[PDB]
């Protein structure tokens with residue numbers, strides 16, 4: 023390899039978004055550039071809509087995906103992933119005045135690879151509390167997959183971008199959402215978003231998968247090995263921790 027093209031969405035701050043001049047910026051961009059430097063390969067970031075990001079990779083329109091993409095079982099059937107470059111649990115989001123905020127959380131950290139009867143009872147509690155609550159999620163995410171498979175009785179609306187989910191939640195068109203702590207903590211840390219709050223268990227595993235990784239075609243075994251070596255080195259020297267703190271305001275590095 024001499025040069026690679028990496029696709030990103032550009033609508034998922036602080037992973038990948040656009041600055042004042044319309045340039046692609048964020049954790050995924052800074053990390054992507056750092057990894058390519060370690061691999062001694064020219065880096066080119068391209069904007070690609072979330073809907074179609076995976077089929078455009080398999081069609082060979084670019085070499086990789088760095089777009090806050092979770093390493094999840096459904097995606098693993100289609101593409102390969104690098105080892106994770108960020109780890110994050112999932113949690114719920116609502117408004118600061120919502121009665122949903124008064125809900126008792128019996129299980130703070132909820133791993134879903136295996137669901138015990140106790141863990142199922144907690145999921146069932148939230149399901150019943152959410153019956154009548156209007157949820158919004160971004161389409162094609164593990165957030166959508168969770169709500170559709172784990173909480174099918176809950177009314178869900180799917181959106182093209184997470185920005186439109188947040189806009190509808192602020193306007194009161196939806197009552198709650200679901201996303202990672204890595205997305206929600208920087209969102210709610212903004213003084214702009216004092217009217218928004220995280221709540222509920224912090225979930226990991228199951229359909230959420232095992233970390234955020236670089237999406238690569240299954241046949242591109244060499245490129246995966248190059249990315250895995252670069253990620254191991256970027257984690258080891260504290261580069262991932264440094265970039266995580268810079269973009270997220272906390273350490274989400276593996």
Ligand SMILES: C[C@@H](N[C@@H](CCCNC(=N)N)C(=O)O)C(=O)O
Nearest residue numbers: 031034089091092163164202205
């Ligand atoms: C890290 C991120 N992962 C989700 C949402 C990704 C949406 N990506 C994008 N809009 N560029 C997933 O893999 O489905 C999250 O849970 O918050």
